[PDB]
Design an enzyme around this catalytic site. Structure first.
Site, short mmCIF file in Angstrom:
data_model
loop_
_atom_site.label_atom_id
_atom_site.label_comp_id
_atom_site.label_asym_id
_atom_site.label_seq_id
_atom_site.Cartn_x
_atom_site.Cartn_y
_atom_site.Cartn_z
N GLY A 1 -13.39 -1.14 28.56
CA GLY A 1 -12.48 -1.92 29.39
C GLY A 1 -11.02 -1.57 29.20
CB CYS B 1 -10.63 2.89 31.34
SG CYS B 1 -11.95 3.49 30.25
CG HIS C 1 -13.78 6.06 34.66
ND1 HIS C 1 -12.77 6.63 33.89
CD2 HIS C 1 -14.10 4.85 34.13
CE1 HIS C 1 -12.49 5.73 32.96
NE2 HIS C 1 -13.25 4.65 33.06
C1 LIG Z 1 -13.44 9.91 31.81
C2 LIG Z 1 -14.37 9.23 31.53
C3 LIG Z 1 -15.43 8.43 31.20
C4 LIG Z 1 -16.78 8.92 31.12
C5 LIG Z 1 -17.81 8.07 30.80
C6 LIG Z 1 -17.55 6.73 30.52
C7 LIG Z 1 -16.23 6.25 30.54
C8 LIG Z 1 -15.98 4.89 29.92
C9 LIG Z 1 -15.31 5.06 28.58
O1 LIG Z 1 -15.45 6.08 27.92
N1 LIG Z 1 -14.59 3.99 28.17
C10 LIG Z 1 -14.01 3.78 26.90
C11 LIG Z 1 -12.71 4.15 26.57
N2 LIG Z 1 -12.14 3.95 25.38
C12 LIG Z 1 -12.87 3.37 24.43
C13 LIG Z 1 -14.21 2.95 24.61
C14 LIG Z 1 -14.98 2.38 23.58
C15 LIG Z 1 -16.28 2.02 23.80
C16 LIG Z 1 -16.86 2.21 25.04
C17 LIG Z 1 -16.15 2.76 26.07
C18 LIG Z 1 -14.80 3.16 25.89
C19 LIG Z 1 -15.21 7.06 30.91
#
Ligand SMILES: C#Cc1cccc(CC(=O)Nc2cncc3ccccc23)c1
Ligand SMILES: C#Cc1cccc(CC(=O)Nc2cncc3ccccc23)c1
Lengths: 304, 304
Positions: free
Chosen positions: A143, A145, A41
């Site tokens: 961030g 990820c 992603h």
């Molecule tokens: C697979 C996938 C996918 C889908 C949509 C979006 C994303 C981005 C995503 O979810 N990143 C994050 C991961 N961890 C904690 C987080 C806390 C706050 C905001 C984002 C966070 C990944």
């Protein structure tokens, strides 16, 4: 003595962390040999993150679009490929800090250390369990990820998890290092049922043995039980059914304390039916399930 | 989102760990520049460990008696000296892995990561607090002596603790890196009163703010309190009295959630007087005091 939620020393993994930037997205990547592994992603924008066509999005990308930085040095990308939900960016230089490593797919109920990272830089390390429902209750912000989960056996790092997503429920989802999601999750910003979770019974029992080893004994009783009777209680309290394999993995802890696994099951049964009564066990007021039988022996014996 | 007992990445400290053997005792040492720091009880035997004359015991030792090994390489000892309860073994080679570092004496109620070590090899990393009574509730076995506690600010490692002793109560005692014991403890196998401990009030409040940030809000109430009224409750429940300095350190968390520090104090007051009622906060069924206001902001913002 003393019992802590101990994570593996993160040194070997810190040396593999890089920053991966594609377009406007920046996340973490894992540099092992001449390959950088990161969530696919990284190639998405906010508009196409609701239903991305990853094959189509990756076609618009060339090696030069994947900016990979290890601290302050830029790695030269000579190949890119998608394997399931991960991108593998071939680089012209092998990581001089590559430890002995394996890619493993852990079973639900197993534990691992996570090195949370932002912009390719390590921020912290914590221990956690892969829930029976394949989610992890981590601590991750935007961030994070690409931060990975791992176990270490002497000098060999077994990478088991790569972080990808936070569900609307606040729990975390990710893949093995071949990009296969643990659980039914997809890398799409959509409603995703995590599924009914359960408490890892074998781990709670292992933790009860650690409590006895470390002096907490108040919960020990004059009773015993059978696997059938105990499993009826486990059913009522949303605990994983206990099998003979679980009893067998508890063998060493049973031999060390001299407390038969089924006698410990009767202690757990009384705790489930009556609660803690305002008491604690190893500094916790609930039944802890993030320590496997192997973790307990490891911590209680001091394997390095 | 998510809140974990997160330790600093241990990489910088793993690179400093060595094994120190003197006579028949082996423990851990910390190699920074051309100096190895380790507990002075490395020169003791079981007979003289009840009331050791460290000056007399060290006089029988020469540089060649201190065997220092970094992994599989032997360091050459060219000087030795005792500073309080630590030995400083000067070596002929500066540690190539010496990070930017400081020696700091932490205040009670502050937190730090511990890299548990055996035979100079890292086994695990965990976060803990220096209790108000100067003990640490760690996880240490025989041979863990010399394992250090630290904090990391960007690239600078601030070493705050060196492990020395386990009290008969199962709690841990150690020194700063100048060999000064935290608390009234002496490096002697004798009965040692740890003193009345208290719960770190400012940390519990900081953790309550982390709970609100991460979605756990059930404990928020319609009440407020004053420092005087709250301190009467803190007195009754063996909590540290809350001062204006503590309120000031909670400023940023108060500004982030928009929940006035004294309103959060009223939530803590209700929790102290009524208990959790079988509920949880950030996966804990008791009030957690091992997260400082700084730890909460750090974890909730993602500083690397
Ligand atoms: C697979 C996938 C996918 C889908 C949509 C979006 C994303 C981005 C995503 O979810 N990143 C994050 C991961 N961890 C904690 C987080 C806390 C706050 C905001 C984002 C966070 C990944
Ligand atoms: C100062 C001092 C002092 C005095 C007597 C003896 C010692 C040795 C000592 O206490 N070492 C240990 C430290 N941590 C956890 C341990 C668990 C089991 C056995 C030993 C442990 C130090």
């Amino acid at each position: 003595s003393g019992f802590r939620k101990m994570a593996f020393p993160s040194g070997k993994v810190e040396g593999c962390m890089v920053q991966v930037t594609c377009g406007t997205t920046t996340l973490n990547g894992l540099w092992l040999d001449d390959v950088v592994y990161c969530p696919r992603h990284v190639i998405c924008t906010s508009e196409d993150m609701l239903n991305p066509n990853y094959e189509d999005l990756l076609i618009r990308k060339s090696n030069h679009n994947f900016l990979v930085q290890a601290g302050n040095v830029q790695l030269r990308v000579i190949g890119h490929s998608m394997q399931n939900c991960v991108l593998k960016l071939k680089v012209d230089t092998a990581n001089p800090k590559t430890p002995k490593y394996k890619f493993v797919r852990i079973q639900p109920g197993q534990t691992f250390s996570v090195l949370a990272c932002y912009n390719g830089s390590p921020s912290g390390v914590y221990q956690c369990a892969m829930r029976p429902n394949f989610t992890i209750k981590g601590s991750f912000l935007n961030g994070s990820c690409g931060s990975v989960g791992f176990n270490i056996d002497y000098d060999c790092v077994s990478f088991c998890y790569m972080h990808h997503m936070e569900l609307p429920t606040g729990v975390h989802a990710g893949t093995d290092l071949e990009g296969n999601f643990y659980g039914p999750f997809v890398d799409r910003q959509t409603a995703q049922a995590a599924g009914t979770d359960t408490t890892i019974t074998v781990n709670v029992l292992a933790w009860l043995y650690a409590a006895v080893i470390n002096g907490d004994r108040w919960f020990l009783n004059r009773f015993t039980t059978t696997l059938n009777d105990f499993n009826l209680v486990a059913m009522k309290y949303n605990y994983e059914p206990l099998t003979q394999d679980h009893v067998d993995i508890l063998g060493p802890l049973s031999a060390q304390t001299g407390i038969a696994v089924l006698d410990m099951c009767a202690s757990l049964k009384e705790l489930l039916q009556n609660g803690m009564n305002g008491r604690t066990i190893l500094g916790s007021a609930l039944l802890e399930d993030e320590f496997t039988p192997f973790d307990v022996v490891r911590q209680c014996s001091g394997v390095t």
